[PDB]
From a paper:
In black-grass, upregulation of a phi (F)-class GST1 (AmGSTF1) has been shown to be a functional biomarker of MHR. Recombinant AmGSTF1 has been shown to exhibit both glutathione-S-transferase activity toward xenobiotics, as well as acting as a GPOX, reducing fatty-acid hydroperoxides to less reactive monohydroxy derivatives. The Phi (F) class GSTs, of which AmGSTF1 is an example, are found in all higher plants, being homodimeric enzymes in which each protomer of approximately 23–30 kDa with the catalytic serine residues located at the interface. Each protomer has two distinct domains; the N-terminal domain adopts the typical thioredoxin-fold, with the C-terminal domain being a bundle of at least five helices as demonstrated by the crystal structures of AmGSTF1 presented here.
To investigate the native AmGSTF1 active site in more detail, a cross-seeding approach was utilised whereby microseeds of the Phe122Thr variant crystals were used to obtain well-diffracting wild-type crystals in the tetragonal modification suitable for ligand soaking experiments. Following soaking with the glutathione-NBD conjugate, the crystals were found to diffract to 2.3 Å. The NBD-GS molecule was seen to bind across both the G and H sites, with the GSH portion of the molecule adopting the same conformation as the unconjugated GSH molecule seen in previous structures and the NBD moiety extending into the upper portion of the H-site. The aromatic portion of the molecule is seen to form a strong π-stacking interaction with Phe36, with its side-chain clearly rotated from its location in the apo-structure. The hydrophobic side chains of Phe122 and Met126 complete a narrow hydrophobic channel perfectly suited to bind the NBD moiety. These hydrophobic interactions help explain how the GS-NBD adduct acts as a strong competitive inhibitor following the conjugation of NBD-Cl. Interestingly, the GS-NBD conjugate in AmGSTF1 is seen to occupy a similar position to that observed for the related inhibitor 6-(7-nitro-2,1,3-benzoxadiazol-4-ylthio)hexanol (NBDHEX) and its respective GSH conjugate, as determined in the active site of HsGSTP1.14,21,31 In both cases, the inhibitor ligands are seen to form interactions both with residues in the α4 helix and the loop over the G-site. In HsGSTP1, these ligands are thought to stabilise GSH binding in the active site by preventing its conjugation with natural substrate molecules and subsequent dissociation. It is likely that the NBD derivatives play similar roles in AmGSTF1. Crystal structures of wild-type AmGSTF1, together with two specifically designed variants that allowed the co-crystal structure determination with glutathione and a glutathione adduct of the AmGSTF1 inhibitor 4-chloro-7-nitro-benzofurazan (NBD-Cl) were obtained. These studies demonstrated that the inhibitory activity of NBD-Cl was associated with the occlusion of the active site and the impediment of substrate binding.
Residue numbers in the entry:
A (entry chain AAA), B (entry chain AAA): 2 to 216
Write the structure that this text describes.
């Protein structure tokens, strides 16, 4: 049976989930939620996610929220020998996937996301202006974060090691929107980060979700 | 052999790791890192954590950072039948542990932590004053977050279900410092959240780490 993803397909946190689904070949459906109509706060959505945020996820009777929890459920349930993006079979490998999934959430996203938010999601979505001081500050922070990624990705093809993993998939959605800002060329200053990004953009599952991240 | 935790024992993110270690009965050592001397940026610390933050962790040749990644490595490595705080044996249970570990990081900590930071870690640690507007705003947010916890914890003894888990352990460290602020009595307005907190405070492993979270 279809598992179901609740939110607009464009949403970065929906795309984390839908990318994990494509990468394991799961049958799924995307049920839109209309921010313009406050559906994410409707009682039917609070049933799914009592904090009233997208995405939510339904597998039969199971209702999940927080894109990363959802994601790990998809990767565990549909795990084949050919697709172990969590490396739970290997304690040290599962540890490196964990470290870099935490780095995405606590170090990299907090430096990148406000540039996406200020340069893109504020003018284009909301209509509110671009805070050039939030941008200059996040950009300086992101330069320093990409110095450590550059080091990591000149030793290993992927963040976890020499295998694509959940760690890498975590970075795709917000970075894809970063690449539609005026600051996209920043990655060109980090040739190994760039090469890693192009390898990710070349994966069939990423090209398919990239396709869904338009209005 | 000792595994090693790098940071001051007081640190909330050190305590997440040290609590997971006590809860599985692992032999470990805490190697101090002196913020007053910038040791967290020393070259010896950047070897452990290239972003120059505590905690770091060493198991033999393995070097880990991000307290939650560390934590899951400890819980997987020292997993007994009697201590499965990740519930990886059960896909739905492992999913609920994930959801509420994400909620701690993305919903609960961002509303609680600035009250700890403003009321406690700024005057007592740093010497900078308390932003009463950050406090009033985080408190209103935290009230709404605790309404959803109150609902959850009137159906299940713990956030994951009727079993203590990593989800619950995640909430201990910052909440322990919240309980040393003037706003500690806030939990008394959420009788099930409170009862859950007292059950956590009664666990031998939590009393032992509580003991380490003083100057
Ligand atoms: N840690 C969570 C984060 C979930 C999250 O931040 N979701 C946002 C998604 S924000 C969003 C807001 C607004 C619009 N819009 O169309 O104007 C969006 N379109 O797509 N996503 C949109 C949300 O639902 N916020 C609403 C709220 O907190 O009240 C996760 O990874 O799932
Ligand atoms: N997501 C990470 C978060 C790690 C973290 O925020 N660590 C802080 C810990 S902050 C801290 C800062 C200052 C003092 N002090 O003694 O004045 C501390 N004592 O204990 N912890 C202290 C840090 O090292 N920051 C330094 C930096 O970013 O430059 C995780 O869970 O491990």
């Amino acid at each position: 049976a279809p598992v179901k993803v609740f939110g607009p397909a464009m949403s970065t946190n929906v795309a984390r989930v839908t990318l994990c689904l494509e990468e394991v070949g799961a049958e799924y459906e995307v049920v839109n939620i209309d921010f313009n109509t406050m559906e994410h706060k409707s009682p039917e959505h609070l049933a799914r996610n009592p904090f009233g945020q997208i995405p939510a996820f339904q597998d039969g009777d199971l209702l999940l929220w927080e894109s990363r929890a959802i994601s790990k459920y998809v990767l565990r349930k549909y795990k084949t020998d050919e697709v172990d993006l969590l490396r739970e079979s290997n304690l040290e490998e599962a540890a490196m996937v964990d470290v870099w999934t935490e780095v995405d959430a606590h170090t990299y996203n907090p430096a990148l996301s406000p540039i996406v938010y200020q340069c893109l999601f504020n003018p284009m979505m909301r209509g509110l202006p671009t805070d050039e001081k939030v941008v200059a500050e996040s950009l300086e922070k992101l330069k320093k974060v990409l110095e450590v990624y550059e080091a990591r990705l000149s030793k290993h093809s992927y963040l976890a090691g020499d295998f694509v993993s959940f760690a890498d998939l975590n970075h795709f959605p917000y970075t894809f929107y970063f690449m539609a800002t005026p600051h996209a060329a920043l990655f060109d200053s980090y040739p190994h980060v760039k090469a890693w990004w192009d390898r990710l953009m070349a994966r069939p599952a990423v090209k398919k979700i990239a396709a869904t991240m338009v209005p």
